[PDB]
């Protein structure tokens, strides 16, 4: 396709990989600092249970059992201008398996939308779904 769309898709793929790597290491290994990755006013939806704004997101995570995530699938699209213009946005899914403390092993799909504060990418939305 167009050599600039190629550049936009490829840039997005690198960001999505850097972000998800660090994100999934923060939830498993440093949940104390998990809030730092959300915008002040982000939406979280953990299995259809909403948490709006970091303060409230940041206390959902502190009340969740300890976790270990195995990633297997990563996907990122750059978001079309009209969906949210003047802020370039990435639509990232991560899927795999997760082991919560004192719970059966499960599968998960996590779908973020991220934008940039300065040089750092943070969550605008996050939809988490467990399966097994």
């Amino acid at each position: 396709m167009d050599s600039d769309l190629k550049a936009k898709v490829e840039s997005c793929a690198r960001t999505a990989d850097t972000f998800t790597r660090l994100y999934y290491a923060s939830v498993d290994n440093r949940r104390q600092q998990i809030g730092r990755l959300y915008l002040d006013n982000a939406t979280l939806s953990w299995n259809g249970n909403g948490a709006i704004g970091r303060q409230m997101i940041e206390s959902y995570f502190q009340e969740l059992p300890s976790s270990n995530h195995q990633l297997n699938t990563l996907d990122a699209q750059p978001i079309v201008d009209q969906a949210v213009s003047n802020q370039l946005a990435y639509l990232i899914m991560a899927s795999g398996s997760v082991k919560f403390a004192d719970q059966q092993l499960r599968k998960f799909q996590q779908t973020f939308i991220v934008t940039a504060e300065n040089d750092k990418w943070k969550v605008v939305s996050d939809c988490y779904r467990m399966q097994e």
Partner: protein, 183 residues
């Protein structure tokens, strides 16, 4: 089963868009008629995370999705375009090669994540049956849609919204024992 709702104004857009779009994807014969939702700037990817565990049957049926699937986990950043379908013609072209399905509408979990006058972000998690033109296959799936709202220009000067899909991902995966139980 819990559904998330952004805004209570978005409520009857779940049934209107998601449950009409899904029903019309179902029969692959009339699936070309989804050309209307997509635009010149539309983007579609397909991901497949199905752990195989009737093994030859499974792998030949899942290949229908896999042959188009995209995954950047451990991939070389140059091949990042591999799997990305761009523009209405190209998207509908991939969508017409996928198998026939029947979604289990009772199984569907909804997450509306944004909603305004410009548009919405809407995710569905559910169970569908993959059907052959050989045997039936239950699959897990996710569909995520970034959609925009544009004033339809019928001639009556009454404001109306046409839905367009800007971003689109189908995800194929294992059904959960609970869904299989209750299909």
């Amino acid at each position: 089963q819990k559904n998330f709702l952004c805004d209570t104004g978005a409520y009857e857009l779940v049934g209107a868009f998601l449950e009409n779009y899904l029903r019309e994807f179902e029969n692959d014969e009339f699936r070309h008629n989804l050309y209307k939702y997509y635009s010149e700037n539309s983007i579609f990817t397909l991901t497949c995370n199905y752990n195989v565990v009737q093994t030859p049957k499974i792998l030949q049926r899942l290949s229908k999705y896999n042959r188009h699937a995209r995954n950047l986990r451990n991939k070389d950043y140059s091949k990042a375009s591999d799997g990305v379908f761009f523009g209405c013609t190209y998207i509908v072209e991939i969508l017409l090669q996928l198998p026939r399905v029947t979604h289990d509408f009772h199984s569907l979990q909804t997450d509306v994540m944004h909603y305004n006058g410009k548009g919405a972000v809407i995710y569905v998690a559910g169970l569908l049956r993959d059907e052959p033109p050989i045997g039936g296959v239950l699959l897990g799936f996710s569909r995520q849609f970034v959609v925009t709202f544009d004033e339809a220009n019928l001639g009556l000067g009454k404001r109306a919204r046409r839905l367009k899909i800007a971003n689109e991902r189908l995800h194929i995966t294992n059904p959960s024992k609970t869904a299989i139980r209750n299909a």
